[PDB]
Amino acid sequence: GSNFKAVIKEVRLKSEHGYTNNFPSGDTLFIELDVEAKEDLQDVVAGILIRDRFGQDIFGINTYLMEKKVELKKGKYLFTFKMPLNLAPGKYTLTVALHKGMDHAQECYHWIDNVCNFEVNGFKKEQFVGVCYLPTEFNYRKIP
Amino acid sequence: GSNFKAVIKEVRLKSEHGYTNNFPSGDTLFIELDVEAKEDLQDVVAGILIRDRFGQDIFGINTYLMEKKVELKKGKYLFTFKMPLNLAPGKYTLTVALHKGMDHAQECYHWIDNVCNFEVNGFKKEQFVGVCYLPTEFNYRKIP
Ligand SMILES: CO[C@@H]1[C@H](O)[C@@H](O)O[C@H](CO)[C@H]1O
Ligand SMILES: CO[C@@H]1[C@H](O)[C@@H](O)O[C@H](CO)[C@H]1O
């Protein structure tokens, strides 16, 4: 798998208030990845994958799907992902990867399964049931 | 269960373009409920619950959790919910309810299991994996 022509040196989870692995549902999650390219690299893809305790994919995406071109010159980089964490309360794992190609069939630079364990606790927005939260609006009107 | 002091007479699903039961992932879903109150009712709560093809709770919420007060005089009403359908492609069901109290322990007016079948097909935005879609931002930068 990993050939380490690029390496993920460290992964940090952050809220808008500071570094933490504990988030209320709906809070903004920043994923910071310290990356070092040992050589020049073209067509680099970075991917994240959030899974639950039973290995089920909760949400995964990479920069090929987001349409984001990444080119690395030999040296150091900070990669950042940002997303509202609209998930049910629970315990989750984060997997990260640097590869080539949409489904890493072309080349594998560095894959780290379950690099971070984090958890969602409580609700930042409305309380809700189910695996995820959809921002919802409501109105009603009397009709003659 | 239901005592039918208020009755959901019909439930319809909507996009911003018209009535439909087929949505690309990320499209805005409107849920219309035709409601009949046969008598005056106070402290009414309206709830929706999206489940997947295996009976799993995907997302549910009600107007008590949204802190949206509802009072019904004898007559006819149109209830509308609106939400981004940030879900994986697949087949889903909608369950609806009118009751009293946050968790319907107080009174049950009308509960309809799987009132509508709908499905998410394709991606209005980025393609993704997992049960749900979290709107994500990416950036990278060299660091000394
Ligand atoms: C670890 O991230 C993975 C990885 O980039 C790749 O397998 O594609 C997935 C999205 O399809 C993404 O979640
Ligand atoms: C059918 O909707 C339900 C119902 O209002 C109640 O059981 O509370 C749930 C949210 O907690 C909501 O999904």
Author numbering:
A (entry chain B), B (entry chain A): 252 to 395
Paper text:
The completed glycoconjugate is exported by the WzmWzt ABC transporter to the periplasm where the O antigen is transferred to the lipid-A core to form a mature LPS molecule that is shuttled to the outer leaflet of the OM5.
Indeed, each CBD monomer binds the methylated monosaccharide with about 234 µM affinity and at a 1:1 molar ratio. To delineate how the CBD recognizes the cap, we crystallized the isolated A. aeolicus CBD in the presence of 3-O-Me-D-Man and solved the molecular structure at 1.6 Å resolution by molecular replacement. The monosaccharide binds to each CBD protomer on their flat β-sheet surfaces, formed by β-strands 3, 4, 6 and 7. Compared to CBD’s apo conformation, these interactions position its loop connecting β-strands 6 and 7 (residues 352-356, hereafter referred to as ‘trap-loop’) towards the ligand-binding site, thereby trapping the O antigen cap. The indole ring from Trp362 stacks against the methyl cap through CH-π interactions.
